[PDB]
Amino acid sequence: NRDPASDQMKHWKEQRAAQKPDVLTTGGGNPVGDKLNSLTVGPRGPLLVQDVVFTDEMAHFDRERIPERVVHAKGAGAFGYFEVTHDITRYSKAKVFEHIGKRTPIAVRFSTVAGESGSADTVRDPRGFAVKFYTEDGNWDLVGNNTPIFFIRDALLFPSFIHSQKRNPQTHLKDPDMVWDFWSLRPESLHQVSFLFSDRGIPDGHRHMNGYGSHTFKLVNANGEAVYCKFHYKTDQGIKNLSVEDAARLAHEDPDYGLRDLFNAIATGNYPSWTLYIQVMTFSEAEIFPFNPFDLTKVWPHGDYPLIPVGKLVLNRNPVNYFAEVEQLAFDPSNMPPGIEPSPDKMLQGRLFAYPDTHRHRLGPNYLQIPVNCPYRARVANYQRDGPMCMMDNQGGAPNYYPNSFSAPEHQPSALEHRTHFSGDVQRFNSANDDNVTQVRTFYLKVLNEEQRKRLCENIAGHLKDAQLFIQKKAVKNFSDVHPEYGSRIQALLDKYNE
Amino acid sequence: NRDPASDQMKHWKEQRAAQKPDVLTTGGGNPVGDKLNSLTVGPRGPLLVQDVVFTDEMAHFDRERIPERVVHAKGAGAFGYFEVTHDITRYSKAKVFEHIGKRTPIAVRFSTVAGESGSADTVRDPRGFAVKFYTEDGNWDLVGNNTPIFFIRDALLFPSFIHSQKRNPQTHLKDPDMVWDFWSLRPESLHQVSFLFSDRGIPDGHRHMNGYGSHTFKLVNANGEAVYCKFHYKTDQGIKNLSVEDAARLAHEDPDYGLRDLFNAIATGNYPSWTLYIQVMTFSEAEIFPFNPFDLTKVWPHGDYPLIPVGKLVLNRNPVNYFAEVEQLAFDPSNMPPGIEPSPDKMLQGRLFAYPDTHRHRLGPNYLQIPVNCPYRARVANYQRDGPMCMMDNQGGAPNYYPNSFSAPEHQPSALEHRTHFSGDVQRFNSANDDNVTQVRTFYLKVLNEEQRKRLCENIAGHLKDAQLFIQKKAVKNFSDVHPEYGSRIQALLDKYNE
Amino acid sequence: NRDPASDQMKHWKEQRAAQKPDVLTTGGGNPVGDKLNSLTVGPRGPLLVQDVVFTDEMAHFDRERIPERVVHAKGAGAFGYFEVTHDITRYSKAKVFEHIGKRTPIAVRFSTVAGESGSADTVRDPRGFAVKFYTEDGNWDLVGNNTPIFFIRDALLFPSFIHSQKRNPQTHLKDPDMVWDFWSLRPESLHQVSFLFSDRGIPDGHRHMNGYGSHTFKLVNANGEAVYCKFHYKTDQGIKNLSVEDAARLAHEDPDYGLRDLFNAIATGNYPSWTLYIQVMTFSEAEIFPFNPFDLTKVWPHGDYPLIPVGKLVLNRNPVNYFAEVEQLAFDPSNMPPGIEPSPDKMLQGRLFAYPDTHRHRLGPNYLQIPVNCPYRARVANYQRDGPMCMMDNQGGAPNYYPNSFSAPEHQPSALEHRTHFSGDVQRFNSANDDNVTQVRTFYLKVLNEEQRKRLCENIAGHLKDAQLFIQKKAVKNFSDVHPEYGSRIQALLDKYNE
Amino acid sequence: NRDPASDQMKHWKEQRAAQKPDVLTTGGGNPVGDKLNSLTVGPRGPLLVQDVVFTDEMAHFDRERIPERVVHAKGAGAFGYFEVTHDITRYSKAKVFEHIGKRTPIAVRFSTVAGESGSADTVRDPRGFAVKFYTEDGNWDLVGNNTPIFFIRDALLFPSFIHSQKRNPQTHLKDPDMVWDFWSLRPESLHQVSFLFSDRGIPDGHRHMNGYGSHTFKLVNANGEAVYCKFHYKTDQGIKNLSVEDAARLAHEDPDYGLRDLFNAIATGNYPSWTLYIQVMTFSEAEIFPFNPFDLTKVWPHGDYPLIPVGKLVLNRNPVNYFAEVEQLAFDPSNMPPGIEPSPDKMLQGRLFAYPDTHRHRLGPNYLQIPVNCPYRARVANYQRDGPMCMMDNQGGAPNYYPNSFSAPEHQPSALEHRTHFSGDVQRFNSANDDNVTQVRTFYLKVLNEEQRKRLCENIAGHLKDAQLFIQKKAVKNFSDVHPEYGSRIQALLDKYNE
């Protein structure tokens, strides 16, 4: 007897023993008479096109694959619910927060960032932690990571950052000179790079890590009053990490470690859960905040902005068909119910467009009619019609133009947005020189102990040693700009690694 | 008060008078507060990305269109049922003929051939008359025309023929030189051409024309015995045609004449219905038949192969959304249930590959998961998985391979195909010289009368006159090869049209 | 002999009389030995899969079609050059205006609006008139119509308007109730509706109509000084229209009238040409302008803003292949070279997204690598990589991220945008009741004469009569609000039409 | 200084030091003035739509990915030439074998089978060895593996075999039960499984393994005479293998080991090469051969059918952009020049369809117009037109139908296929019980030595122990059917592994 994942088929049969097997058909419902031998003219003769049983099956086999996600391609998924435990109705009128005890169906997808579909799970990388809330106001996607910050703060650098984290365009190899040339030319990355080369850069699966919206968002209550917030969801199973040596063994021992962990957990009843907190900032506090409160490379410290609890995320169901329910999951930061809205965070302003854009490419123009993506607890009605692979009644014979004298859907004025005043030149403002070291200094000195600082440097040096010396020299300098002992330790190790 | 088609929105509003209008939402189910005005900075300022209401609506509008059909693009649709009235179980075991009184749902498409989506209905053309039977053993797609025959008899000429009947690739205009250079270089077209330019070239809407499967097909009964057959469905409303004069007036007074006629008939309860017949040829009649009995340019004469009634087709329901239910309809001649099998007709052997093929391009790899296309009266079960726009549970966690020791679906030996014996070289055989005139001579002399022959010639000369002289000279010789006076009449009228 | 279009194939053969015909191949370059007869076992036997010549040719015929344009689907194309004849470098620094005498290649596509691929040319509808300039600074797409104004002034209403002008979702029939329910609930349409039912609603081919940029745009000279502008290109062949009586004859006698008139002109050396003008409005004239200067239902009167000439548009070359050079044409308003920039027109702003969006769907992710869409007089170099159907070297092994230390492309600071100050609430501002009648009154009284006013009203009532009475009454009211005699005339004609 | 692969960017900058960096443009050729900061309203404001520099680049990033190969996804590419060295023109007329010394440009792709794009290179799996010859008669794709044989012999079992070799449809994990349930239910796989689990299951990269075409193919000479042949291309660098211990270290130390080993070799002039041999079986010897000569699970022994040399394959060029030259590479077995034809092999017959079919999905309808797929040594001319992403003239204004009297391409009769006689019932013949053991027994006893048999069983037991007991027992039985001591040794080690 083995773990539950290995016994998948065994249980599919047992859960079925009472029935007779189904009749094996074509895609058109036509029963198949023999599907092990091809129609040929004679035992050693050629194949006929009259063999449409072969063409039907092969034709579909040939179209099985769709594009993998451009980022966060290697993923695990699970489904559960969100349950409200505390009252934050003064801040948000979102129905998903309406009363204590309110449950809402969720779907979660964990991921790495850089590796493709066949890569290993226990590698150094940020982790995705995307959560979709099926509310009565339409879906709410909270596309968060295992970290509160990112490496950049303008969306126009993002394709570049990703390119520098993936394969060299000629050799198709991971290229340290690309990784570090970028990071050293963009020191705003220093904060998240210090998180990444810490211990938490390799979590022991998906259940022992925290999630964060990382972005500043906006909450609007019933009076029309607004505050800015951060979301934190913290692991009730406790932070737990793999060491470098153990992560490396599992990388070839079990490439799908974090997939198998999550599936087995839920199957054995160990339902992982997370505690949803927010931080709140008023509009006033936002004007006096020392840094840019919409700079994704900055946290809101806890002492000044403590955590307010909201509710629990619980995962208690495994997917049944991985493709249908995880590969085809699509999270849009732009899916926001009334009560939740976006900040002016440059990076989040780019994500408002990019996600729906790529989903119409990766999955298709009507990807929101796929079941896991459908807002199935909301009544979807508008003037949008047709498109490839239209799957409902296409809203029937309703008038498809607005306004109209024939009683099709109407706009709901109470769902209008919060009005904010802005003034300034319409212009590309340079955010490369916002504070890039202060919060990092704090992390290095007051969050890490001495042993962790030591490991931080060894993990950095073990990867940076493969870059050229002019890149090393520049990266080390950025590290000295945080703390001279941060830089001179790294440089002591590189001096050895360089023989 | 007007015809019922014009009152569609009027009635749509009346059937809703009681309830309230729906909440107008995004495709994500998020209610919109205002959808007549965009999100801008100040009344005369620029448009914001934050306006995800606009993006969501505009983006879908931008994706409304799919590739029209490559032929038969102008279409009208309706729905109904097939009812058995006579017993032909001695020839076929197809569940759709199981017993008298048995109904099966059907869906029909009427079309022209050459015109694109906006072309007129009342033009000289063949008419598609495609019928989809939703049976228990999967779907059965009788994809016929309003002719028993076609212009050619080898599929390799089909892309060519169609190119010649569409727009010149530089000027994008209808070209008579193309049209008649082909027809006169392939005189196998004489038989169908004669049909086209007579009175039935322009039927008075789709309810006053017959439908034929034109190919020879194979029926198989419960003992394993097989016969060949032809399908005829004859209009119970009576053949009725339009004059060249009236067809040309309506071509600009109502380009959608046939579409309108069908909708209004059904809406006022005047339901159209056809009578399905079959002809039956034994295998040993097929060896002694004077022509090639699988020649798609040949009919089976009635005197020797009389019509055997089978039942009624009845259209009694209009589509609710034309796009979802008519435009996305996909018919595959290779959708054949046990009891119905292909002949060796070279032209039908091509259509077994072409239709599924083009449907994966026009509609999508999983187009059979579109409702109106679905085999909703059978159980689809097999080892096909994934593909873009997967719309069911993707078959669940069922074992995806075959054979297996876990009781996934099994093959049904009774559904094997009938086995024929064939012997001969594997090579390309020349069919350009099968009897191209005999059955036409009969049509011209014995079926048509004096006035119809006169009109047949006028209609041909009135379109052949715009081709070059060397092309007219050749066409006329092919016509002369049917009957001297056939050519003589056309050539006398051409001598006049050429001033 | 016949017109030059009809003789296209004749001339192709003549231009090749001297050579031998090419060898006919598969798409893989494998010569074909027979393509009229299919590979079969015996003369009357089944088709084989081994017949890759059939499948290679049938596979591509099955994928011949692409989605037609969602609007303006029916179009005609030609190519030529733009030439500067006057100096407007004090307003715009764009390299297409640099000096008198400079020539830039162009590509033009004329079109109707609503009719699909097969509809008639000679119908009442606006006419598209899009102009692609191939600049050294990249492409410039002046996507114009044959009117200065449009029916609506907010992009959100654009799907609706179109839906109302196209087919009823259930009957697939042009619906008068949809047309006028919309127009009568949105009286901003009054201006362009009076343009459309006037003599210029049906132009006599594409050479006898003007072209307008319609939108206000922004020009920026070398000093950084900016003005607002309007592009008018006026036919050098003279305004010429068709009467309702003749347009309806041709609509069935020659559906492709405009397409034939443009090819035949060019082929016979009668090259059509236009004269490009601008209006100019300083930022300070924009502030005092009585209406909203960015309202697309409004014109700038000539007395206050006279026409300034710029150059000539000349069309002097037909397409060689219509699909590759016309059907696949893609104009993006957003393609704007330094010195030409958008105004805050709500409609234009919307079009900045729409066109690239739909072109990725209609043509594909890399649609700008199609030769006719290529900026083949600039040097494209950036950090975009891959995609479906990637056709060049994909920019080689160049570093693919930015910034980088390995000398891949750099930004050009002189090509930054003009900076404008905006201030206001971010909200949805209601423009429904900007002045809707003033400039229409002027048109009805001062531009048309007695006869033309008569025909304008007969054309409006000849179409509005089919709508319901409550829709009629409302429209007429909207027409009275322009002038009592406007709506009263229409109402007198409607009274007769309603028997 | 480092290896060449890591100095890629270093050498790109050096090879450019003379010139100045290009101007960074949009896709449309428009220079950008700042691509590090986004267009906003005030420094902490929201993002505008008229930031088309952002949109244009993100929209393409969002569409960088295409579908991965449905098998053999992980790959490494190189280009070179094929040079004839011996005269086989008595067997084949193919222009690639015309004379000694004749060179042809080639392109080769190496791969594994079951891992996705991200997986490691040093795992136990077959290896792809696909060769594209660009001959004057079009392209010749020889789609070969590093084995003479394969696991199955009917293509209707392919999708299933591949499903079992990949991931569980619910857990997304590698599932030994699926692996061995399939293999133990289809003992035909015994031959190739004993190859897979010997030392050659893991090659030391791609330069130290042989190539084979596995399938019997047909050769046809200038006289029309045919023979059946096998292609073997052996490594001039020598067979060399990784041990299980080192293959696993490298699977985490360098996932891309085989890719780097090829690139560094070519870059340093150590060009790998292969020797091309054929075996030859006359049609007479094919009637008396002891097994089925077209049984993909059978080799032709060397004693009876010796290797006949042909020429060399040499890889002396790396790719410059991996995506454009290696990921978009498409190989079709059906690309076969005159002189080379398929044999009736049931598995090859299915590859004649499957590959073009998946290539139209994976890449697109016109994937043969992608440079590296272009038959650029041959002249493509025919009657195929249009399609998504049509990239050349589209063959201009040339007549698009055949036959025609206007001098478009003609068929070449000498390119016709060899005619073979076939006689037999058209049915599905069982091939499950062709001799499944005999050649395996020879391998085990006569090809392997003592040590190698021991490791063969250890490799097998290490993997089979994770399957259920009932699957183990059945697999061992199939190994006892080869040789009692084969099944014995495996059962003694499974007894230990099961504690």
Ligand code: HEM
């Ligand atoms: C402007 C900056 C960014 C851009 C342009 C961007 C772009 C993308 C794209 C195109 C995808 C693919 C989505 C799909 O295929 O369905 C994706 C996935 C994802 N992104 Fe980002 N991203 C950005 C920053 C971020 C940030 C700040 C976070 C978290 C705070 C994040 C978290 C994720 C996650 C978790 C996924 C995987 C979603 C899934 O499992 O389907 N990304 N991103």
